[PDB]
Design a protein around this ligand. Structure first.
Ligand SMILES: O=C(O)CCCC[C@@H]1SC[C@@H]2NC(=O)N[C@@H]21
Ligand SMILES: O=C(O)CCCC[C@@H]1SC[C@@H]2NC(=O)N[C@@H]21
Ligand SMILES: O=C(O)CCCC[C@@H]1SC[C@@H]2NC(=O)N[C@@H]21
Ligand SMILES: O=C(O)CCCC[C@@H]1SC[C@@H]2NC(=O)N[C@@H]21
Lengths: 123, 121, 123, 121
């Protein structure tokens, strides 16, 4: 749900995710990673599927962060695809793809894959 | 580096991707898939890293589509992560993750992964 | 290490993995899944990289299970790629790809991706 | 269904895959990669699901290579998961995971993912 997704979230690495879900299915916010060639905050944009189902199904969503800001440019972007499960203890379970810009010759090693789980902080 | 990302691209499945890249790293547009529980257009939003590096490398980017519009709601979202290469034949080579909303029980099989290559041809 | 990998392992879904690591870098065993179009045990084969590094690095390894046995044929195969971390509490952290056989038309939806963590049981 | 899997295949990077499929679902052979911290041949072992279904579908299979041999040890392993399609032009379309051994600290970036397509040409 938008209200349920809106908030500050942290993942197992200690990275911060601040987001707002709009009525139109949009997601906008900032991301701060605890690891990598990153520093300070980066802008994120994504979408969620606003009308999930009733049932105890998660809401699918995804978002992107290009790792460039006024302090660093890592020439890479990460996308997170996963689901939001609300409740007392709401979580966002995801899998992600991190692509670095390479020459055609090294494209075979441009993408990393992983999974992150986010926990919402009160408020 | 960045540049002719803006345009209409098509992938090997015949899907259509119409995007606009903004000068600060934003990507906006619509997507129409040739396959799946989808029909007509969907909104997409993403980001790309400009200021790519100056050893002829690609420009990294990614975007998302939630499969809900005024015709269908498939309860899923797809994210594409990859890089753009311009030149005579410009290409956007990606790997995607498609997550459908499931119950906890079926969460082990909620995510499909694949790769798509887009051209303006 | 071979001895360290050899044993019975279980993952978060409640699936069983029984394996033997040979001196040559080989892995052979049976797998029993708690979920899916599977029943009873299936044969598994894989390899590990026998001479890791010293250090507190994991040992990379991977294995495959084709989901066909005398009771069921699901026409699919799964491969697990990950690392073995030994110690008192040894774990095998992996990511996997599950491919189903399809027509060329539905090949875009043939592969599922996920991650599993295995815990070794004593002995 | 199963059948001409046995043979020498090559992928878009020019790597060579020489395999033997056994009648009960086993795959054995050697692999030589054209890229990476690798040289000469490596042992591979896998499985395929025969008895594929009778709606012209592919045969699922997968295999593993640990990148250690008498020349180099790169402390990594790769697994390829995909399906074989025979016919005039036989193909093995896969998606792979390459995991390198890291310390817990670097475990978030231990795994690369990609796709390879093999032909006997
Ligand atoms: O190093 C880079 O290229 C940019 C930083 C990448 C940080 C990654 S993105 C996925 C994973 N989740 C996090 O919170 N951090 C790492
Ligand atoms: O069925 C659904 O869940 C909605 C449609 C999904 C279409 C997918 S997304 C990845 C692949 N590339 C495309 O252009 N379409 C399919
Ligand atoms: O349904 C099938 O096609 C065969 C069973 C698949 C079970 C999968 S493999 C990855 C994940 N890990 C498990 O232990 N079980 C599921
Ligand atoms: O550098 C390493 O870690 C060992 C060599 C890895 C070669 C990879 S595996 C996937 C891709 N396909 C190939 O044929 N070679 C590369």
């Amino acid at each position: 749900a938008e209200a349920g997704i809106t908030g500050t979230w942290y993942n197992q690495l200690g990275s911060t995710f601040i987001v707002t879900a709009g009525a139109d299915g949009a997601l906008t916010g900032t991301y701060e990673s605890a690891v990598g060639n990153a520093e300070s905050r980066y802008v994120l944009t994504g979408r969620y599927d606003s009308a999930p189902a009733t049932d105890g199904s998660g809401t699918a969503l995804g978002w992107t962060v290009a790792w460039k800001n006024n302090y660093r440019n890592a020439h890479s972007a990460t996308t997170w695809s996963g689901q939001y499960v609300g409740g007392a203890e709401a979580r966002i379970n995801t899998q992600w793809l991190l692509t670095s810009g390479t020459t055609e010759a090294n494209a075979w090693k441009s993408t990393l894959v992983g999974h992150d789980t986010f926990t919402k902080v009160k408020p």
